[model samples]
Target: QLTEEQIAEFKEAFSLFDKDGDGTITTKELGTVMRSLGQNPTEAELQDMINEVDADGNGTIDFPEFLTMMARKMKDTDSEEEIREAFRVFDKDGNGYISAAELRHVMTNLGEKLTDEEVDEMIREADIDGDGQVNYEEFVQMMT
Candidate 1:
C-alpha cells in the first residue's frame, strides 16, 4: 500500500515534525501537528494511526513510519446504505448487532442447511471491530 516514491516525497513533511532531532514519530507528536492544522483527531482515527507504529517498540520510526502510517489511513471503503439493510435481516434481536449466537438461529429455521464451516469461521473474520460481534459497518464489509 506504500512505496518509496511516497515515502520520499513525505520525507520533507515528516522532518518538519521530528522535533526530538531523532527519527521517532509518535502519534501524540503527530496529533499535536494535526491540532495545529485545525483538525481534531478522534480517538478512533488515532487508534488506526498507531496501529502500525513502533512495531519494534524500542523506537525507530523513520520517514517510512509517518508516510506509510498515514498512507495506510488515506485508503478505506464504504457503500450503499440500502446494501446494509440486507444485513439487518441477520440481526435477529433487532438490537442492531449480529453475533455468533444469533447467526446460527437466524439461518436454522429457514429450511436450508447452513454452510457453517464457512459461516462459523466466517464470524472470526467479520468480527473486525474486535468486540467479538458484528455491527452494521462490520457486516457490510463481511458481506462484501
Candidate 2:
C-alpha cells in the first residue's frame, strides 16, 4: 500500500539498519538503534517486534520483510470512511478499540472457532501501538 516514494524511503531506512551490509536487520541492532532514537525497547519487546515483521522466521529481518513492515507503517489502500465503519462495526463495545475478546466474540458468532493464539495474532498484526487492541487507525491499516 506504499507509494513509490515511501518505498524508496523505506529502502534507505532498511539500508541504514543493515549496517553490516549483510542484507538483514538483526534484533540487536534494531534494539540498539531504537534506543538511540529514544525508544528503550526491552529484549522481549524487540523480539515481539521482530516476530511481527520477520516473515521468513529466519531470526533476522530481510529486505522484503522490512519493506512489508514499512508499507504497513506508511499507507492503507482504502478510503478512510470505509475502514472507519468496519472498525466501528467490529469494535462493538464503543471502547474505541477492538480487544481480543471482542474479536473472539465476533468470530464465534460467525462459527469460526479461532484459538486464543489465532485471535492474539489477528490483533497483533494490526496492533501497531501494541496496546493489545486494534484502534481505528490500526484496523484500517490491516484492512488495506
Candidate 3:
C-alpha cells in the first residue's frame, strides 16, 4: 500500500534501527538500545516481537522480518504515536536514507534524550557505511 518513495522511507527507517548490520535483530542489541532510551521491553515483550519478526528462525530479524514488524507497529493507531511514528520522522529528507544527524534529530523529537556519547555509540552501531552515514540499502540490511 506504500509508494516506492514510502517503501524507501521504510527501508531507511529499518536500517537506522537495525544498528548492527548483521541482517537480523538480536535481543541484546535491541534491548540495550531500548533501555538506553528508557524503553525497556520485558522478556516476554521482546520474545513476542522476535516471534513476529524472526522469519529465518535465526533468533534475529532480517530485512524482510524487520520490515514486516515495522509495518505491524505502524498500524497500531493508539498510544505513543510519536514514539511509534518515530521511524517515518527519522527518514527526514524522504530520500530513504538516515544519516547520523537525522538519527539524533529523530531521537530528540521523540524526547528520548540521548547524550552525545550515547548518540555516538548509536551511530557507531548503525552507521554501516563506514562512510559514517546510513543509506537505504544499508539500512534495510543492517540487522540490530
Candidate 4:
C-alpha cells in the first residue's frame, strides 16, 4: 500500500521511536512516547500498538509491517456492532448522528481529552465531504 519512500519514512520514524536501540520497539519505549503526548496509555493500549506494528512477532517493526500497520490504522472498518458502540458512546442524546460537539465529548470520554483544534482535525478526517456532521454511513466510513 505504500511506496518505497513512504515505507522508508515509516522505518525512519520507527527507528527514532525505538529509543533503546533494541531491534524491537518495546511497549515501554512506545508507552513513554504516548505518555509524553498526554495519552497515558494503559498496558493494553501499549500492547495493542506493539502488536499492530510488529506483524512478525519478532518484536520489531520493519518497513513492510509498519506500512501495513499505518494502512490498517488509517483504514480500519471494525464490525458493525463495534462501530455502533463507538457511535452510541458519542451520541449522548441518542440523536443517531454526531455533531462537532458530540465528537469532542466522545473524545473526552475516550481519554483523548482533545483540544478544540484536535477535535476539529478529527472532524475533518472523519466527516468526509466537509458536511460538518456525521450520519451512520459517515460514522461507519470514518472507522475505516
Q: Pick by lDDT: which candidate is best?
A: 2
TM-score, model 1 to reference = 0.38
Per-model TM-score on C-alpha atoms: 0.38, 0.48, 0.48, 0.47
Candidates' RMSD to native: 17.3, 15.5, 11.3, 6.7
- lDDT by residue (56-139, candidate 1, tens digit) is 554446766666554654223534664455566567677878877677665453322457674677577788868877888887
- Using lDDT as the measure, name the better of candidate 1 and candidate 3: 3
lDDT of each: 0.62, 0.76, 0.64, 0.68
Q: How well is each residue in 1-144 modelled by candidate 4, as lDDT tens digits?
A: 558776765675566557766655677877876654345779888888788767788765655675676556533544577567667766778877687798776555434466788677767777766777777788887566
* Model 4 whole-model lDDT (C-alpha atoms): 0.68
Q: Pairing residues by index, what is the TM-score of model 2?
A: 0.48
Candidate 3: C-alpha lDDT: 0.64
Ranking by lDDT: 2, 4, 3, 1
Misplaced by over 4 Å in model 2 are: 1-3, 73-144
Q: After superposition, which runs of candidate 4 have C-alpha atoms over 4 Å from their true positions?
A: 1-70, 73-78, 129-131
Query: Which portions of model 1 show Cα errors greater than 4 Å?
Result: 1-79, 114-119
- Extract clashing residue pairs from model 4: 76-144
Summarize candidate 3's per-residue lDDT along 70-115 as a digit string, tens digits.
Answer: 6554333444444434444566777666766787876764444667
* Clashing pairs counted in every model: 0, 0, 2, 1
